[PDB]
Amino acid sequence: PVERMRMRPWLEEQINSNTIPGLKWLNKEKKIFQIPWMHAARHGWDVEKDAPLFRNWAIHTGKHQPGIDKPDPKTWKANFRCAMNSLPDIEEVKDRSIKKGNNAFRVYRMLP
């Protein structure tokens, strides 16, 4: 019911399995993974690219339960960002004025 699969390995798995067309290890040897994120919908509309992950956050991070509480995706969006400010081994890189004409995702370098 309330287990702790751990986000670090949860991502190492999703990234290795390549469940989202864009999220994946750019350099798995040094553990570098990049996700596309919902750069399009900053709230809740064009946010289906990473919604399967973002939505799983509520169940994977043990925060929302289907049948007992309300499935609010608005907070799930913020939950995703908290993970980026966590695990003292992740380096987020979304570019600033160069790679901004194709996708502009968030490349995260994860240490061991």
Structure description:
The chain is of the alpha+beta class and 112 residues long. It has a single domain (1-112), classed as Arc Repressor Mutant, subunit A, CATH 1.10.10. Helix content is 29%, strand content 15%. The chain has three helices and four strands; from the N terminus they run H-E-E-H-H-E-E. Strands 1-2-4-3 form a four-stranded antiparallel β-sheet, covered by helices on one side. It is globular. Interacts with BRD7, IRF2BP1 and IRF2BP2. Interacts with CREBBP in growing cells; the interaction acetylates IRF2 and regulates IRF2-dependent H4 promoter activity. Belongs to the IRF family. Keywords: Acetylation, Activator, DNA-binding, Isopeptide bond, Nucleus, Phosphoprotein, Repressor, Transcription, Transcription regulation, Ubl conjugation. The modification N6-acetyllysine is found at residues 74, 77.
Summarize, please.
This protein is α+β, with helices and mostly antiparallel strands and 112 residues long. Helices cover 29% and strands 15% of the residues. Strand 1 (24-27) and strand 2 (32-35) form a beta hairpin.
Q: What percentage of the residues does DSSP assign to strands (E)?
A: 15-25%
Q: What is the first-to-last residue Cα distance? A: 28 Å
Name the shape in a single word: globular
Determine the structural class based on helices, strands and strand pairing.
alpha+beta
Q: What is the CATH-assigned architecture? A: Orthogonal Bundle
Kindly provide the name of the CATH class: Mainly Alpha
Q: At the fourth CATH level, what is the homologous superfamily?
A: Winged helix-like DNA-binding domain superfamily/Winged helix DNA-binding domain
Q: Please list the strands of the largest sheet in the order they lie side by side.
A: 1-2-4-3
User: Count of DSSP E strands?
Assistant: 4
**Tally of individual helices:** 3
How many structural domains does the protein architecture include? 1
* Main sheet summary: 4 strands, antiparallel
SSE order, one letter for each helix or strand: HEEHHEE
Radius of gyration: 14 Å
PDB class: transcription regulation
Keywords: transcription regulation, winged helix-turn-helix
Assembly: monomeric
Entry title: interferon regulatory factor-2 DNA binding domain, NMR, minimized average structure
